[PDB]
């Protein structure tokens, strides 16, 4: 019931983390 929340939130975090990792690489590159 709430486990499906924590599961979708953990995943959502993982997605936003991979985007942060790539975005940081871009900004680290354009220098």
């Amino acid at each position: 019931h709430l486990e499906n929340e924590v599961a979708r939130l953990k995943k959502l975090v993982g997605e936003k983390t991979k985007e942060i990792d790539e975005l940081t690489r871009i900004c680290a590159d354009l220098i």
Partner: protein, 96 residues
């Protein structure tokens, strides 16, 4: 009102930010691994493709091509792509 795309040498999507959904309607999973020409109007495929051949010889310099992008709802969107190269190609795809 735009999103930053990041392709490889040929122009296949290697990275797209969350803003693709608002500007084009597609999700990041739906663009990655796919060529940008595939979403281009047949009329402007040659232009976009030639424009991509150019960013390489420009070495760092910025180009600007305008073409039709096929949104998720199967309608053409005039896109102002401001692209350049770094290894990989970074594009700033604007919706007008």
């Amino acid at each position: 009102t735009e999103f930053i795309s990041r392709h490889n040498i040929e122009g296949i999507f290697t990275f797209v930010d969350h803003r693709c959904v608002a500007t084009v309607g597609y999700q990041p999973q739906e663009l990655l691994g796919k060529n940008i020409v595939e979403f281009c109007h047949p009329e402007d495929q040659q232009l976009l493709r030639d424009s991509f051949q150019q960013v390489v010889k420009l070495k760092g310099q910025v180009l600007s091509v305008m073409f039709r992008f096929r949104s998720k709802n199967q309608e053409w969107l005039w896109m102002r792509t401001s692209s350049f190269t770094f290894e990989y190609i970074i594009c700033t795809n604007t919706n007008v």
